Design an enzyme around this catalytic site. Structure first.
Site, mmCIF file in Angstrom:
data_model
loop_
_atom_site.group_PDB
_atom_site.id
_atom_site.type_symbol
_atom_site.label_atom_id
_atom_site.label_comp_id
_atom_site.label_asym_id
_atom_site.label_seq_id
_atom_site.Cartn_x
_atom_site.Cartn_y
_atom_site.Cartn_z
ATOM 1 N N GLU A 35 14.916 6.754 -54.462
ATOM 2 C CA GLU A 35 14.457 5.510 -55.078
ATOM 3 C C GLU A 35 15.016 5.351 -56.489
ATOM 4 O OE1 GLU A 35 13.079 2.947 -54.031
ATOM 5 O OE2 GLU A 35 12.041 3.459 -52.167
ATOM 6 N N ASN A 46 15.322 -7.596 -57.330
ATOM 7 C CA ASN A 46 15.476 -8.069 -55.958
ATOM 8 C C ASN A 46 15.771 -9.565 -55.932
ATOM 9 O OD1 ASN A 46 14.541 -5.512 -54.395
ATOM 10 N ND2 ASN A 46 12.898 -5.877 -55.880
ATOM 11 N N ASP A 48 14.241 -11.864 -54.327
ATOM 12 C CA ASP A 48 13.039 -12.678 -54.158
ATOM 13 C C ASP A 48 12.328 -12.923 -55.489
ATOM 14 O OD1 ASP A 48 11.990 -10.207 -54.728
ATOM 15 O OD2 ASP A 48 10.934 -9.955 -52.827
ATOM 16 N N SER A 50 11.369 -10.603 -57.586
ATOM 17 C CA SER A 50 10.602 -9.430 -57.994
ATOM 18 C C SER A 50 11.518 -8.335 -58.533
ATOM 19 C CB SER A 50 9.774 -8.894 -56.824
ATOM 20 O OG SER A 50 10.597 -8.303 -55.834
ATOM 21 N N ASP A 52 11.717 -3.817 -58.951
ATOM 22 C CA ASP A 52 11.181 -2.482 -58.698
ATOM 23 C C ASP A 52 11.185 -1.678 -59.994
ATOM 24 O OD1 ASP A 52 11.001 -3.116 -55.959
ATOM 25 O OD2 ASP A 52 13.007 -2.328 -55.568
ATOM 26 N N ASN A 59 6.981 -2.293 -56.761
ATOM 27 C CA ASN A 59 7.426 -3.683 -56.862
ATOM 28 C C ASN A 59 6.405 -4.623 -57.503
ATOM 29 O OD1 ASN A 59 8.023 -6.581 -55.591
ATOM 30 N ND2 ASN A 59 9.909 -5.370 -55.512
#
Ligand code: NA
EC number: 3.2.1.17
Length: 127
Positions: A35, A46, A48, A50, A52, A59
């Site tokens: 990760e 991301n 969308d 959002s 991380d 998220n």
């Protein structure tokens, strides 16, 4: 902070992640590896809207607030910046809520693709 492998293993164990919700310590270290590469300050945008955050790439669509993810939630009741601390307390406590919300560790894409169904125990080997 960039954690060493067994350093993180020890940190995660002390925060009670070993066998938490059924997941052995090796799984959590493996997830952290793919990760964030053991880096607490990792961030990933991301498509969308959002982002991380942190050593487990939690998220902002559901779990933390960064004030720029439209229509999102904040279920861990923390600023996303809290997930970037050298102290992994916030990331662990949030991760515990995430894994408890059904689906298990399948919420973590990197774990699902690189860790699930592999020799995860190798990631705490020699600690
Ligand atoms: Na820590």
């Amino acid at each position: 902070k960039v954690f060493g492998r067994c350093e993180l293993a020890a940190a995660m164990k002390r925060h009670g992640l070993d066998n938490y919700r059924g997941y052995s310590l090796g799984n959590w270290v493996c997830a952290a590896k793919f990760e964030s590469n053991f880096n607490t300050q990792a961030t990933n945008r991301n498509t969308d809207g959002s982002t991380d955050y942190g050593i487990l790439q939690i998220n902002s669509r559901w779990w933390c607030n960064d004030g720029r993810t439209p229509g999102s939630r904040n279920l861990c009741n923390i600023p996303c910046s809290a997930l970037l601390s050298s102290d992994i307390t916030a990331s662990v406590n949030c991760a515990k809520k995430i894994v408890s919300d059904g689906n298990g560790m399948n919420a973590w894409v990197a774990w699902r693709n690189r860790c699930k169904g592999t020799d995860v125990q190798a990631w705490i080997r020699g600690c």
